[PDB]
Each structure stands twice: as structure tokens, then as C-alpha cells.
Amino acid sequence: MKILKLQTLRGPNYWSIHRHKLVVMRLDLEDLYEKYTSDIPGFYKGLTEVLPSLVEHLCSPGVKGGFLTRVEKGTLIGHVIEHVAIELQELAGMPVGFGRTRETSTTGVFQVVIEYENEQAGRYAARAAVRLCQSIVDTGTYPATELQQDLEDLKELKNQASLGPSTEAIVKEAEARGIPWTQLGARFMIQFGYGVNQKKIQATLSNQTGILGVELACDKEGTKRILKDAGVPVPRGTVARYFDELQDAIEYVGGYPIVIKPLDGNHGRGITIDVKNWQEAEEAYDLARKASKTKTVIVERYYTGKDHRVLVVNGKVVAVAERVPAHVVGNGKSTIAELIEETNRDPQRGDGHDNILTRITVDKSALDILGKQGYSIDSIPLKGKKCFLRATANLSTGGIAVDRTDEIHPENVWLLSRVAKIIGLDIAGIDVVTEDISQPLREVEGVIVEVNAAPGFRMHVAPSRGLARNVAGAVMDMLFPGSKNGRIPILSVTGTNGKTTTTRLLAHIIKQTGKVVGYTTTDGTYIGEYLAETGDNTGPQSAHLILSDPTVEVAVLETARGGILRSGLGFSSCEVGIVLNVTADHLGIGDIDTIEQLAKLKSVVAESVMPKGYAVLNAEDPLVAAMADRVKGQVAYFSMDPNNELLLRHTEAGGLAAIYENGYISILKGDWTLRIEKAVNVPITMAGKAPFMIANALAACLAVFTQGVKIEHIRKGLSTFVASVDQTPGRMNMFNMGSYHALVDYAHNPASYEALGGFVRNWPGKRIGVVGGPGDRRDEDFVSLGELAADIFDEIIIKEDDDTRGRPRGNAAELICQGVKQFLNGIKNSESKATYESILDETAAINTALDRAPIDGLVVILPESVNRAISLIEGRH
């Protein structure tokens, strides 16, 4: 067993839709290619002893233990490998239930698909499954120590790439509301939405939380001063840094009792709660001074009452919880010694950062605190009344929270909302000490102890003594006020031969509307009028750049099949999905070997259309039109033939189609015909000579019309879009220099070759062509290219791309020569006797093509890179 390739998918993909997280591996079965489990000595027993949990796999039998019966009858090792990977990552607490295995075109390689919850964990499980199965086939069993090591590694991977409970809850709420979310790679920030409608959170702070408010909240004395200036009842306190100032400060606060705390503290280090005389105040001051990082200590009046935590989101009180410190009640005539561990044996209590209820830690400090209680370990509580173990009233110690949201006085709600607004925090956690939260803070001597930025609401979503509160819902309401997601219109263009031109035309048409359009094509990624990134940029790695840009209002993404195969789609859904055509030209790449497979792959864009979206399909293409079903949302057809029966039937019942009827680009809205242009005033059609460009214009116009774009905007965009070097790099770029003309193009497959010929054959001058193709294509494609070039052209110069993609140098050139020779031999008389010659250099090929161009001739160039031809024709004027 050798792993040849390991790919991970993060969006809708070839293998499944709504199963975005998948991993696919090319597994080589060098020796066990046709070796069933029933034929392997001791395989079944060793496998079922290593992992007894496989009995829960309801396989194709559909009954408990069906996979075990499948192994009994004899099954290929790829199936058991996928099942053991699923179970291996399932044992680590990660539920996954999708798996597929298919035979590839090559003899010995399988393709195994595993659903994952964590990318690293999924890849690790996929790598470990083959090792486990190889060990089982070699020795009959797998060591238990290696199994435990692998599960511990999987658990570590799951824990490492895990969000915290606050971020997890917020993300779950966003997913429930259908708001897209992605993880930024900088500071554990989560981005909600797309483009100009995006928001960001880290854990609880949003992108709208102010620096000034957070910094003020972090400052205890500044916050107290600000709240006191606003009339908020803060505790009466004073700062002190030297021993001598203590007596004067205690005189100022108003007597006894008092509180001694440090200015800066974490987990309440060195904070005393209640002291009533001199010496204890002295030692508390010493402890706080040695606990503070700046030697300075707060001294304030002590206020009796329970400690409440109030959560304010968007200036509204969302949850109120009373923090009762760790305690035990002897209502069952039992003392502390039994209840300390009786509570610890409750399943609710747990450690870590997931379970709020922590075990009652009987620390030496806790022993001292219960010493100050006035009772002992075996001292039975009187009457069955609460007896406490600590006074910090925190969940980390082992305390409990009581929901008080329904009992807070409205005046208190108003005061706390004012406090949150005064500090300047959209989300704030306010600590209140009061005897009764149901009465105003003025009647009782309630005080505001502190204001917390980025508070943890974990205690409010699981109070354990009241009703849970939907804090994540409140946060999402703040981030997205109405019934609005963060989505921007997404237009995904897929197809075999016209993705780039259609994408650029759509971008231009939408640019006619006053909107910033971010679009990625084969040439590069553009935002507005400026280039944002160079290169290929036809995959999700470039779609993320557009979707995360804060200025993009509409996204038009050219979705090549390569990106879908490699990692799926970069988005969950699209507003418009355009499928132009599916032609079997570059077969054999990946697992795609038949045109049905290619159609299934390209149908991902059509099937990803949201229910309120539109799918623009070519009615003239039978395979594309076959995607009419299994598509959620409306369907729109475009056809170059106005008499298409399917299109007419679709328009009769409904509408939303586009045709080219009598020299017009027209939109059919049912029984109404809306003409856009004469198709001779559209520059890219070149007076209607190029029919494929007319089809691209039809698709683009239909796509923009389905979104409500005005007819005048479509008209202006179609009229002002040019097919020259200023806008189109090499898409039907015609250059005039007087003596002849040069037509540089991007044709590399038989379908685009036929489309190019359908326009070149109309030229009345000499036809010179430099043709070629990528080296990763099949030989039959090269033969077809050669014969088509023989059919359409009069002078042939064959060139092979410098980046040959692993193919031996030259081979494609002589095979295109074989194709042109076959076409030449297929002609009886001198009907078409085009001359042929082959040179393997791009510069030499274009130089020879431009050197021998006669008067009024046409020279067609199909270079590896458009910039080479552009520069070469720019230098020669």
C-alpha cells in the first residue's frame, strides 16, 4: 500500500453536496489489488479484535453489523480502509458518516473518500488507516499501544484546532441563521458574511467594539471615576501604595468593614473580602501589595450582598446571573465531609474549559477559608442551611449560577444599559453586589464593582439553577440586525470554453451599475478597476480574496474544473450559477475520464445555486440542459437557436430565457420579448461574425437580468465592452498594422478550435496559424487539433508549450503533425492543401508567422502565454 496523493475538500465538490468536509486519497494496491478479506488468513478476527466498534457500522446491508457480514463474504481492502478510517476518527469523539471508494482508470489505484470534522485529524486518520490495515494483513493484528497512541494523537489534533465555547456558540448560531463564516489566519478571528456586509469577532469582541471602551473597562480606577461622574453608585474607595497611607484611607472610606484588593489582578490574586480590624488589614495589604504587578493596592468600603453578573449586549440586558459561592446544604442530616465528595460524584461537574461546574477543590486556602467559617469538617449544618467553602463566588472554584433575568428591576436594567453605553462597550459583563436585584440599587446599597470587556457568557447559557439565555442569538442580532445575512451576490461562471470572456462581460455590465465588482478570471483577480493579484486565480484560494475584501459588493467568480476537483467550491451557495457548455476535450486528468463525469463535475456549480437563486444553462447543449433537474432554485435557458423546443416550452410556462432571434440579443420573460442590441453594435461579436461570443453575451445578459439589472445598464455594458488589448488580454484580440491583421487567441481544445474556425473561415485573406496545446492532454485531442487546424487554416506552424506538464518534449508536435497529415491524406484533389511545418519555440513560431504574412492576410496565434504575443506584436508596431 502506497499513498500517492492526499487532497482535502472544504466546500461542495464532485463527491457530494452538503458534505463539504471530505478527504480523498489515491491509494495504490500494489499487491492486494484483488485480494478479498475472506481470502486473507486471520484478517477478520484481527480486525474485529483491534476495533470491536466496527459492529456499529450499518453498511450496504443496512442492518447492525452489516459491514462485518460484508467482510465475511470477502471485500476489497479499500472498503475496510475507509470504514476503519471513519471508526478511527469516530472513536476520538468526532462523528463522521460519509465514505466512498471507486476504481480509477489506472489498474492498481483506488480513490477513497473520508468525511472529516477536523482537516488535520481527517488527514491523520486517513494516513493511519492504511498503516493499520497493512499491519493487520502482515501480522494478523495491530498493537494496542500503537492504537492508543493514534487515538491520543487524534484527540490532541481535535483539541488543538478547536474554537472556544464562546466562539463555538456564536458560530453555531451563525450557521443556524445561514450566515457564512470563515476562520481568519491572524488572531483566531472569525469573519461572518462577505464583502461590504462582513463582520468580525475574536471571541466575544466584535469589529465594532471600541479600543477606548475596552481600555477604560480594563482601568478599575478610571472606570470608577467615570461612573461616579455619571451618578452610578460605585463603591467608595481609595488607592494606596505605602503602609502609612492605610490608616488615612480607612478613615476616608467611612469606617469598617473594608476591602483590600490589588489594582491589577487575575483570578483574584491577593484579594481579601471582609476585614474588620487592624492586623488582618495589615496582612491583607501586604498580600495584595505582593500580588499586584505595580505594588499599588485599592482599599474600599465593604458592601454586603450577593454578587451578580449582568450581561449587556447592544445596550440591552440579556442575562443576569447570581454567583453563589461553593457551598453545601445539610438538609439530609449530613455534614461537610460527605457532601464534599457527594457533589464531586455528580455528572454535571467537570474540569477543562467546556463544563462550567468544576469539582469542589479542597485546597489549603479553602481549608483556611472554611476555618474562618466558624465550623469544622464534621460539624453538621444547622436546620439544613447553606454553609460555604469560599467567598470568591466563581465557577472555577466550584460555585453555581442562578438565573435572575426575569427578576431584575426595570430601573436596574436602565442603569446597567446606561453603564454599558457610558463605558462604550457593545458587549459588556457588569459585576453588581446587591442584596436584592429585584429592587433599585438606590433603595438597597447596591454597587457596580467592575465592568468587563469580552465577557464569558458560558455561565448564562447553562445557569444550572434557572432558564438558559440565548446569548449567541443576541450577539448575532447585534451583528446582523434584521433578517439579513452577510451575503453579497455571487455569480459563479463554469463551462469548458467561455468562462473568462463571460466573467469579464458580467463584471463590465455590473460595473455599469454603481457597484464595486470583485471578479477573478484566468488572467488575474480584479477589484473594481484595479488588479488585486496576478496568476491563474481560478480556484477557491482566489475566491476567498474577493469574498473577504471589505469593498466588494458583487462577486463574479470563474469556477474552473481544476479548483472543484482539487478542493471543491470556495462558497456554500451562489446567487447565479452559469454553465456554458460541457465538451469532452481534456479528459483523463484526475479521475475524470468520460464526458458524463465531466458533466457531473461541472454540475456542482448548478446544484450549488440557492433556492432563491438562478441557474443559467445552455439549452442547446444536451448535457448542460440535462442539469435542469436536481437544481434548487429557478432555471434560465440561453440558446443561440431561437427555435429550441425546450427553451420555448420553458418560456411558455414561466419564462426567463434569452435567445438570438433575428440579429437581436433578446430576453424572453414568458410571452414578452425584450431586445437588447442588434448584435452588430456589440464589439465583441464583431458584427455578429463570432457566434460563440454571441452565446457568451446571451449568458451574461440573462445572468444580470435575472438579478434585476435594468435593461439600459445591460445595453450600455454590452455596447461599451471591447475585445481589444485594452480590456481583453488575448480573447479575440484583433490587431491591425495595415498590411495584414493578427488574431491572437486562447484556443487549446477542439471545441474552441471549431469556434475559432467558424469566424476565421469568413476572412477573405490568407490564413496563417500557430497552434499548440498543453502537454497534459490525450493524444486523440492533439490529432483532433491537427485535423481541425488543417481544415480551417492555410499555413500551419505547430509549436509545443514550453511547460509540457511532464510530457516528453516534441511528442505533441509530431502527433499534431500526424493529425494534419491524416487530414491532408483524406482529401482527393487540391481542395485544401495547407502547408505544414513544426518548430518548438514560441518566439521562433510567432516570428515566422509574422515574417511571411502577405497583403491582407490573417495570422492566428495560440501561444502558451498571452503576454508573450502581446509584447511581440507591440514591439513590431
Place this chain on the structure above:
Amino acid sequence: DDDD
């Protein structure tokens, strides 16, 4: 720190 981190969720105060």
C-alpha cells in the same frame, strides 16, 4: 484573560 480571554473571556473575562
